[PDB]
DNA sequence: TCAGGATGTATATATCTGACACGTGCCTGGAGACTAGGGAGTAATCCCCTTGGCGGTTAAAACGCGGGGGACAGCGCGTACGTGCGTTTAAGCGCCAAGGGGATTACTCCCTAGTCTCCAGGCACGTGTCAGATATATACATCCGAT
DNA sequence: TCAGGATGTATATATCTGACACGTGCCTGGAGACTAGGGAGTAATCCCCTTGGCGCTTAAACGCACGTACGCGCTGTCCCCCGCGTTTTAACCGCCAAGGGGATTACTCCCTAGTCTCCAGGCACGTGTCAGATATATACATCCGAT
C-alpha cells in the first residue's frame, strides 16, 4: 500500500520512529507500548515551540532576527518556569540577566 | 558517519511560531542538546516508574505521569494536555 | 584639577557593562595552562582536545560567577559593602561544598 | 649556573587580579578585598581537579588517551552541573 | 600495592 | 448560635513555638527572635507541600488511593534527600 | 537565677544528644492531611508514611537552623531572624 | 556433580547468584558478563564490613553491645570519606552530631 | 511475602568484624537499604557507561569504573583492590 | 572566694521485649550441553593533537600614588529577649463499630507487543549563495563631579 | 543650582560569512503476516485505615512579670581600597616538521553469553526462648551565681 508516517497521522512535526526505536534501543523497559512514542513526541514538541517562542521574543527585543545563546539564556531565565525547569544547566555562552542589589547604587 | 539529531525537527517547529525568524548552529547545537536531556529525563522516570510497579511496558500512562511529575505544575498541564490530544488523534486516525 | 570620578561609580560602570556581555574573562592559555598542569591527577601524559578544555572553562567560569554572586548576597547581609574571604568560606559552605 | 628552570611561577598566578575582578563585576559586586584574590584561586584549583578527575577516568576506561568534550560533559553531569553546548 | 586499614577513626 | 463551627483553629499554629525552639537548640542556636516562628512555619508548608505532591503523583499513578510509605521514599529521593530506614 | 545563656547551653547540650522527634505527632500529621487534601480529595495515609514525612521535615528544619545560625554568627550576632533564614534559603537554591 | 556456590568458591560472603538475577533482570544492559557479579559482591561487601567496624566502634564507646541507628549516624558522620559519600542521605532517627559555636561560648 | 534482604549477609558481615555485637531491626533495615541505594548507584552508572561506549554487555571493567567513579578517596582504592582479589580468586578456582 | 543550690552523673534492681537460634519446604542457583553473535584483532584512510622552536601586534596587567570613605572600635540606651512561676489545654492513650482498600494467590484468554521480510521515501551529506550581523565612523542626548 | 565633561546610544555604511536552499544515496521506518506471553478481569482471604465519637493522665504551652545584656544608632579615626596614569609583557595569531592517536569501514572468527533441562541446597518464614537496655531511685560529684 502507500506509507502513512507516524508523525502525519498523530499530526506532530518531531519524529516518532525515531523516538520510537530510542526507546527500544535505550533499554529502558522490555517493551515499549505503542502510544508512548506519541506521547513524548508530542511533549517534547510542545516545549520546543515554548522555548522558541520566548526565544524569538527576546531576539525580536533585542532588534535581531536570529536566535542565539544569549538570547536563549534570557527566554530561560526571565520566566520563572523554565528556570526552575532548567535549574543546574549551564547555557554556553549564556551570560547572565544584568541586576544590581540596591544598596550598591548612590544616594 | 551518519549522526542522527533534532535540528530538521526544531527548526520545521521554529517556521511556525515565528515564521520569519532564523537560528544560530549554536543555539541549534543547545537546542538539540536540551532536548535530548528532556527524553533521557522523561524516558528515564518512566523507566523506573515501570520498574517500580512490577510492569514491563512503557506506555502513555508512564509518560504521562513522568511529564506530569518532572515539568512543574503550569507547564505539565499544557505539556499534558497536548500530549493526549495529540495520542487521541493517532489512534482515532 | 583634571575630571576625577569619585569611588564607586567606575565600579558600577563596569558592573553594567559585563552583565551584558557573554565573552570569556579568563585567558584561554593560562586556563588551559593550569587545566593540563592539573591534569597529572589520576594520570600521566595525556592529549585534549580544544573542545574539552572550552567546556572546562565555561563550566569554571559559571561556577564562579555563581559563587561571586552569593558572596556579595553575605558580604551585603552583614551591612558591608566589601566582599571577604569569610563571606566566600560561608557562602561555599552553606552551599554543601565545605 | 643557569641549565635549572629558576622560572615558570605557578599557573594558578595566570588567574590574575583583574581577571577575577571581571568575574566579581559580572557577579555585580562593587567593592573587592585584597585576599579574595587568593580565596578564589584556592576553590577553582579544587573545582578544576575535582572535574578533571571525573573526566580523566572516564577517558581511562574508553581505553583512550585523549580526553574529549563529552568525557568533560559526562563528568560534568554526573557531578551534577549540566552543560547545554558542547556535544 | 594491596592497599589495607585507612585512617580508622580515633574516639567517640 | 453555635450550630456553625465558628470554633476551629489553624493548622500551621499547631507547630508550636517551644517545637520550633526545640528544633533550633538541636540545630545549636541561642537566641530566637519573634520572627522566626512565622517564617519557620511557612518554609515547613512550603517543603511539606513540595514532597506531598510528589508522593500523590506516585499514589494516583498507581491506581490507588493510600499514600504508602514507600511511595513518600520515592518522592523524597526524586527530590533529592534519599531517606534510609522505612524500606528501599 | 540563672545568668541568661546558661539555660541556652544546657538545652543545646540536652538536644544534640537525643533522636528523639521534637515536633508533636498528632498536630504534624494533622497538618500533613490538611496540606494534602488540596491536591486530591479522599487520600490515605498509613502511619509510617507520615512517619517518614515527619523524619525527613525534622531533618530538613535542624540542617536550615543550622545554617541559619552560621549566618547569624557571621554578622556578628547571636540572635537569629528572618533575614537570616531567607539568605540561607536563597543561597541554597530554594527561594 | 556436587554443587559449590560462586560465593564460596570467589571467597566472599555477599551473594553472587541474586547480584547477577538482579543485573539480569534490572534493564541494565542486554547481557551481562561472568565476573561483574563478583566484582560487585566484594565492593559491597567491603563497604558493609566498613561502615560496621565504625559502628561497633561507636557503639562499644557508648558501653553498649548492639549497633543503633544512633550509632550509624554518629559513625558515618564522623568519617570524612562516608561522609561524604552519604552526604546526602539522612539516616532515620540518627541524631545530630554534637556541636557548639564557639562564640556562643560564655567568657 | 517472600521478599529479599542481605540481612544474613550483614549480619554475616557484622560477625565477622565484631564477633561480639549485634545489630537492632532499625539498623540492619538502614543497612540494607544503603546496600540497596550503593547497589542501585553502581549498576546505574556502569550502565551509562557501557551504552556511552556502544557496548552491550556489563563487565567487570565497567564495574571497576563505576566503583572509581563513585566512591571517593580511599574507599576507591580500597574497595577496587579487594574486588580484583575476589575475582581473581574465583577465575583461579 | 566560698558555701548554697542545682544539675548531670555513676550504680544496683526489676522488667521486658526484641535479637537470636532452630526446623520446613520451595524456590531459585548450579551443573551440563548447544549455539550464535558480540567483541577482539587486523588492515586501510584521514584529521586532529603533540613537542620544540620562531616572529609580531597590541591590549591587558603590573605598579605606584593620592585621597576619600568605608571598616571597625567605643559609648550610651532602651528595648526585646531571657528566666522563672503558675495554670490551663491538648497530646497521647486506650476503646467502640462498620465498611472499604489492598496485596497475594490462582486460573483464563484476548490482544497487543515482538520478529521476520520486503520496499520505497525520510533524512543526512555535500554542494552553492545572499542576507544578517558585524565592525567602522559621527551627532547626540544623557548622568556625574563642582557652584 | 547651573554650566562643564565623559560616556553610552542611537544613526548610517561597507564587509564577511554561515544560515538557508537544493539534489542524491542510503538506510530505516512502514506494510503485511504470525505468534506467544504480558496484562486485564475475576474472585477468595486477611489486615489496615477511615470517621464519628467517649473517658483519663500528665506534662507542655501559654501568659505574666522583672530585668538585664545586646542590637542599634552616633561618633571618631584610621587605613585600605579605588581611580588614574605609565610602562611592559604575555596572549594571540600565524608558522614548521614528523608521527601517533582515534574515528570510521570492512572481514574473520573464536568464545562466551543466553537458552533449555533437571535437580538439589540456599534462604525465608514461623515458632520459642533469654539478655541488653531501659526506668526508677539513690547517693556523688561537680559548675555557677551572690555575698
Same mark, same amino acid.
Given at each position: 500500500?502507500?506509507?502513512?508516517?507516524?508523525?502525519?497521522? #498523530?499530526?506532530?512535526?518531531?519524529?516518532?520512529?525515531?523516538?520510537?526505536?530510542?526507546?527500544?534501543?535505550?533499554?529502558?523497559?522490555?517493551?515499549?507500548?505503542?502510544?508512548?512514542?506519541?506521547?513524548?513526541?508530542?511533549?517534547?514538541?510542545?516545549?520546543? #515551540?515554548?522555548?522558541?517562542?520566548?526565544?524569538?521574543?527576546? #531576539?525580536?527585543?533585542?532588534?535581531?532576527?536570529?536566535?542565539?545563546?544569549?538570547?536563549?539564556?534570557? #527566554?530561560?531565565?526571565?520566566?520563572?518556569?523554565?528556570?526552575?525547569?532548567?535549574?543546574?544547566?549551564?547555557?554556553?555562552?549564556?551570560?547572565?540577566?544584568?541586576?544590581?542589589?540596591?544598596?550598591?547604587?548612590?544616594? | 558517519?551518519?549522526?542522527?539529531?533534532?535540528?530538521?525537527?526544531?527548526?520545521?517547529?521554529?517556521?511556525?511560531?515565528?515564521?520569519?525568524?532564523?537560528?544560530?548552529?549554536?543555539?541549534?547545537?543547545?537546542?538539540?542538546?536540551?532536548?535530548?536531556?528532556?527524553?533521557?529525563?522523561?524516558?528515564?522516570?518512566?523507566?523506573?516508574?515501570?520498574?517500580?510497579?512490577?510492569?514491563?511496558?512503557?506506555?502513555?500512562?508512564?509518560?504521562?505521569?513522568?511529564?506530569?511529575?518532572?515539568?512543574?505544575?503550569?507547564?505539565?498541564?499544557?505539556?499534558?494536555?497536548?500530549?493526549?490530544?495529540?495520542?487521541?488523534?493517532?489512534?482515532?486516525? | 584639577?583634571? @575630571? &576625577? =570620578?569619585?569611588?564607586?561609580?567606575?565600579?558600577? &560602570?563596569? $558592573?553594567?557593562? =559585563?552583565?551584558?556581555?557573554?565573552?570569556?574573562?579568563? &585567558?584561554?592559555?593560562?586556563?588551559?595552562?593550569?587545566?593540563?598542569? $592539573?591534569?597529572?591527577?589520576? /594520570?600521566?601524559?595525556?592529549?585534549?582536545?580544544?573542545?574539552?578544555?572550552?567546556?572546562?572553562?565555561?563550566?569554571?567560569?559559571? =561556577?564562579?560567577?555563581?559563587?561571586?554572586?552569593?558572596?556579595?548576597?553575605?558580604? $551585603? @547581609?552583614? /551591612?558591608?559593602?566589601?566582599?571577604?574571604? /569569610?563571606?566566600?568560606?560561608?557562602?561555599?559552605? $552553606?552551599?554543601?561544598?565545605? | 649556573?643557569?641549565?635549572?628552570?629558576?622560572?615558570?611561577?605557578? %599557573?594558578?598566578?595566570?588567574? *590574575?587580579?583583574?581577571?577575577?575582578?571581571?568575574?566579581?563585576?559580572?557577579?555585580?559586586?562593587?567593592?573587592?578585598?585584597?585576599?579574595? +584574590?587568593?580565596? *578564589?584561586?584556592?576553590?577553582?584549583?579544587?573545582?578544576?581537579? %575535582?572535574?578533571? !578527575?571525573?573526566?580523566? *577516568?572516564? *577517558?581511562?576506561?574508553?581505553?583512550?588517551?585523549?580526553?574529549?568534550?563529552?568525557?568533560?560533559? +559526562?563528568?560534568?553531569? !554526573?557531578?551534577?552541573?549540566?552543560? +547545554?553546548?558542547?556535544? | 600495592?594491596?592497599?589495607?586499614?585507612?585512617?580508622?577513626?580515633?574516639?567517640?
Amino acid at each position: 500500500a502507500k506509507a502513512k508516517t507516524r508523525s502525519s497521522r #498523530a499530526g506532530l512535526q518531531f519524529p516518532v520512529g525515531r523516538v520510537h526505536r530510542l526507546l527500544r534501543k535505550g533499554n529502558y523497559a522490555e517493551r515499549v507500548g505503542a502510544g508512548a512514542p506519541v506521547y513524548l513526541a508530542a511533549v517534547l514538541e510542545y516545549l520546543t #515551540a515554548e522555548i522558541l517562542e520566548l526565544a524569538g521574543n527576546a #531576539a525580536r527585543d533585542n532588534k535581531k532576527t536570529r536566535i542565539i545563546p544569549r538570547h536563549l539564556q534570557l #527566554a530561560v531565565r526571565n520566566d520563572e518556569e523554565l528556570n526552575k525547569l532548567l535549574g543546574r544547566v549551564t547555557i554556553a555562552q549564556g551570560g547572565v540577566l544584568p541586576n544590581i542589589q540596591s544598596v550598591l547604587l548612590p544616594k | 558517519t551518519r549522526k542522527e539529531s533534532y535540528a530538521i525537527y526544531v527548526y520545521k517547529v521554529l517556521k511556525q511560531v515565528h515564521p520569519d525568524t532564523g537560528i544560530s548552529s549554536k543555539a541549534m547545537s543547545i537546542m538539540n542538546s536540551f532536548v535530548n536531556d528532556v527524553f533521557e529525563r522523561i524516558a528515564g522516570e518512566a523507566s523506573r516508574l515501570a520498574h517500580y510497579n512490577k510492569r514491563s511496558t512503557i506506555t502513555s500512562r508512564e509518560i504521562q505521569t513522568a511529564v506530569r511529575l518532572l515539568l512543574p505544575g503550569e507547564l505539565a498541564k499544557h505539556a499534558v494536555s497536548e500530549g493526549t490530544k495529540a495520542v487521541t488523534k493517532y489512534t482515532s486516525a | 584639577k583634571p @575630571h &576625577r =570620578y569619585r569611588p564607586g561609580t567606575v565600579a558600577l &560602570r563596569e $558592573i553594567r557593562r =559585563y552583565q551584558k556581555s557573554t565573552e570569556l574573562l579568563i &585567558r584561554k592559555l593560562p586556563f588551559q595552562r593550569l587545566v593540563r598542569e $592539573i591534569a597529572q591527577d589520576f /594520570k600521566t601524559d595525556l592529549r585534549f582536545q580544544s573542545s574539552a578544555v572550552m567546556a572546562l572553562q565555561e563550566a569554571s567560569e559559571a =561556577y564562579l560567577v555563581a559563587l561571586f554572586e552569593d558572596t556579595n548576597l553575605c558580604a $551585603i @547581609h552583614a /551591612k558591608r559593602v566589601t566582599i571577604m574571604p /569569610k563571606d566566600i568560606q560561608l557562602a561555599r559552605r $552553606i552551599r554543601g561544598e565545605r | 649556573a643557569k641549565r635549572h628552570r629558576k622560572v615558570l611561577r605557578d %599557573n594558578i598566578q595566570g588567574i *590574575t587580579k583583574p581577571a577575577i575582578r571581571r568575574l566579581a563585576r559580572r557577579g555585580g559586586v562593587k567593592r573587592i578585598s585584597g585576599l579574595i +584574590y587568593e580565596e *578564589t584561586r584556592g576553590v577553582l584549583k579544587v573545582f578544576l581537579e %575535582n572535574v578533571i !578527575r571525573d573526566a580523566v *577516568t572516564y *577517558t581511562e576506561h574508553a581505553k583512550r588517551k585523549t580526553v574529549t568534550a563529552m568525557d568533560v560533559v +559526562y563528568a560534568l553531569k !554526573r557531578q551534577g552541573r549540566t552543560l +547545554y553546548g558542547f556535544g | 600495592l594491596n592497599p589495607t586499614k585507612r585512617e580508622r577513626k580515633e574516639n567517640y
